[PDB]
Copies of this chain bind each other. A is one copy, B any other.
Amino acid sequence: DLPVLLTDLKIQYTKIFINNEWHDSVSGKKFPVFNPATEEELCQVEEGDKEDVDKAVKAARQAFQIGSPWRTMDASERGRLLYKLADLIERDRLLLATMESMNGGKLYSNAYLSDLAGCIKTLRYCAGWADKIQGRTIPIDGNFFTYTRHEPIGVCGQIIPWNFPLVMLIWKIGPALSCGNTVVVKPAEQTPLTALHVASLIKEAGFPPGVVNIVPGYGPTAGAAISSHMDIDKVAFTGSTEVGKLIKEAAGKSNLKRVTLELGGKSPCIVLADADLDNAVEFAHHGVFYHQGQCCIAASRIFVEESIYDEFVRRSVERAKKYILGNPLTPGVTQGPQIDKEQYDKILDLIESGKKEGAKLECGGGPWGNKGYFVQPTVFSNVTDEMRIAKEEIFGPVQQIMKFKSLDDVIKRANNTFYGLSAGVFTKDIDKAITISSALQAGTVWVNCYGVVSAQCPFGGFKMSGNGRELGEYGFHEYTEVKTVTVKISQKNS
């Protein structure tokens, strides 16, 4: 029972954002934006392509020039702007929470309580680091005085998905701006609206023109323009592994720009006999079914000891049947829609393979409703390692429960995947928890919990689930360029 927007929501910002002003698309074309729940068109946004990006890049490069406000400005002041921006987002919390819920098909409660809270907390965390990005002074051999500067890199192209459009945005700009970089953000073609509102707040907060630029458009057009641009120093991507390979490839052909990928995963869970079953069942459920299972950190594969396998499956099903599919703005709705028809069809396709390959359908396993892209909360059991649903990322409300007996084997089964974004370990024994977590090849390992991401902790992936960390102290290292200054002196003294 949360406060809803008193007025009716009325979209305003639907244009390209360069030098803290609203540009039209160079082509003049505009793409539509729909509510995934109602399939209704909300508005049309300016369709950005290369020409638009080239403008944004030249604005960002100009803003990054030596002697510009952004470079000369105090580190403390950069954080002050980030902290003001957080306050502006907190002010327009109902507006954004509503807009995110409509556009992203995201439960309003989650949108208000998780996403908007996450944006504020993270921005404020990032504000803190601004004037705490310190270099080093090295006691080098010889009569020399050596010191390093953790400078900003420069123009950073930043590509975000549709699953958490706001949170994902702050994860990009927050660290980047804190370190003193200028950014060219390309939001998803599905979910540009939320980001564009923030662009207005960035102007209002008083960020120098060109520091933040936002170019809404399609992936192959605008996104490719960023990945291959010759004056972009870094690219930051979050999306399918398929595209991540094109981003890194296009970065190689262009100007060897720096790369941070945050790709999807088939994140496994291991539930040993000695485990709080309710804890494990609830967190594993939340892990895989959060935001219609449209999380990179989805608890896809859930390995369970034989002794407690049947009991786990029993509880996981009854929990999954207590969902009410409908409009995310509607109070009482506990599950929302998929983003678009592409995911909808993909998820249903993998659900069919689960049946065809002969996994036991415990519940769900089909679409819901005439209107909207709604998928029933599905649960598969007796799943094998060589099934499509136990290999490919689903990115929908589908849970796979699998049994094990040997601890050594299940760890190797869990690690047997090109992905490795996260994992979950559920046990009371310390030795087990520490050793298992050390063995698992995951970027973030949760013990007796799941999906616990915060601003302070660094979040990334092993193998083909990422190419860098995004948060915490270590996340800031990848938005800086380390210059080494070695000065000759007459005599050195320790």
User: A248 interface residue, CB < 8 Å from B?
Assistant: yes
B256 contacts A252, C-beta separation under 8 Å: no
Which of the segments A48-56, A74-82, A106-114, A304-312 contacts the partner chain?
A74-82
> Whole-angstrom distance between the alpha carbons of A251 and B151 in the complex?
27
| Chain A 69-87 interface 0/1 with B at a Cβ cutoff of 8 Å (1 = within) | 0111111101110010000
> Whole-angstrom distance between the alpha carbons of A282 and B434 in the complex?
23
> Whole-angstrom distance between the alpha carbons of A20 and B90 in the complex?
28
**With A457-B138, A493-B72 known to touch, is A488 a contact of B252 (CB < 8 Å)?**
no
**Residues of A within 8 A of B (CB-CB), count:** 114
> Whole-angstrom distance between the alpha carbons of A452 and B146 in the complex?
10
A428 CB contacts on chain B under 8 angstroms: 428-430
User: A370 interface residue, CB < 8 Å from B?
Assistant: no
A326 CB contacts on chain B under 8 angstroms: none
User: A416 interface residue, CB < 8 Å from B?
Assistant: no
> Of B80, B142, B147, B448, which contacts A74 at CB under 8 A?
B142
A416 to chain B, nearest CB (A): 13
User: A152 interface residue, CB < 8 Å from B?
Assistant: yes
**With A137-B148, A139-B75 known to touch, is A252 a contact of B252 (CB < 8 Å)?**
yes
B149 contacts A137, C-beta separation under 8 Å: yes
| Chain A 465-480 interface 0/1 with B at a Cβ cutoff of 8 Å (1 = within) | 0010100111001000
A131 CB contacts on chain B under 8 angstroms: 125, 128, 139, 141, 455-456
The number of times this chain is found in the oligomer is: 4
A484 contacts B447, C-beta separation under 8 Å: no
> Of B130, B180, B244, which contacts A256 at CB under 8 A?
B244
A321 CB contacts on chain B under 8 angstroms: none
> Whole-angstrom distance between the alpha carbons of A75 and B125 in the complex?
11
A443 contacts B483, C-beta separation under 8 Å: yes
> Of B138, B144, B474, which contacts A482 at CB under 8 A?
B474
| Chain A 423-461 interface 0/1 with B at a Cβ cutoff of 8 Å (1 = within) | 000011111011101110011111111001011111110
A11 CB contacts on chain B under 8 angstroms: none
For A74, A180, A241, the residue with the greatest tally of chain B CB atoms inside 10 Å of its CB is A74
A73 CB contacts on chain B under 8 angstroms: 494
A489 CB contacts on chain B under 8 angstroms: 430-431, 434-435
B261 contacts A449, C-beta separation under 8 Å: no
The chain B residue with its CB closest to the CB of A484 is B444
A124 contacts B473, C-beta separation under 8 Å: no
User: A162 interface residue, CB < 8 Å from B?
Assistant: no
**With A438-B149, A473-B132 known to touch, is A488 a contact of B447 (CB < 8 Å)?**
yes
> Whole-angstrom distance between the alpha carbons of A251 and B250 in the complex?
11
Q: Is the interface of A mostly helix, strand, loop or mixed?
A: mixed
> Of B128, B252, B439, which contacts A132 at CB under 8 A?
B128
> Of B439, B457, B460, which contacts A140 at CB under 8 A?
B457
A483 CB contacts on chain B under 8 angstroms: 437-438, 442-445, 462
A137 CB contacts on chain B under 8 angstroms: 134-137, 147-150
A403 to chain B, nearest CB (A): 22
B141 contacts A76, C-beta separation under 8 Å: yes
B457 contacts A146, C-beta separation under 8 Å: yes
A73 to chain B, nearest CB (A): 8
User: A127 interface residue, CB < 8 Å from B?
Assistant: yes
The chain B residue with its CB closest to the CB of A438 is B493
A76 contacts B487, C-beta separation under 8 Å: no
User: A43 interface residue, CB < 8 Å from B?
Assistant: no
B147 contacts A490, C-beta separation under 8 Å: no
> Of B138, B252, B438, B449, which contacts A486 at CB under 8 A?
B449
User: A253 interface residue, CB < 8 Å from B?
Assistant: yes
**With A131-B456, A457-B486, A474-B482 known to touch, is A67 a contact of B448 (CB < 8 Å)?**
no
User: A258 interface residue, CB < 8 Å from B?
Assistant: yes
> Of B132, B437, B487, which contacts A485 at CB under 8 A?
B437
**With A76-B124, A467-B256 known to touch, is A491 a contact of B67 (CB < 8 Å)?**
yes
User: A246 interface residue, CB < 8 Å from B?
Assistant: yes
> Whole-angstrom distance between the alpha carbons of A413 and B152 in the complex?
21
A447 contacts B253, C-beta separation under 8 Å: no
User: A129 interface residue, CB < 8 Å from B?
Assistant: yes
5 contacts between A and B (CB under 8 A): A76-B125, A131-B141, A134-B473, A431-B489, A445-B486
A residues sitting closer than 8 Å to B (CB atoms) are 66-67, 70-76, 78-80, 83, 121, 124-125, 127-142, 144-152, 179-180, 233, 241, 244-253, 255-256, 258-259, 261, 263, 279, 411, 418, 427-431, 433-435, 437-439, 442-449, 452, 454-460, 462-464, 467, 469, 472-474, 477, 481-494
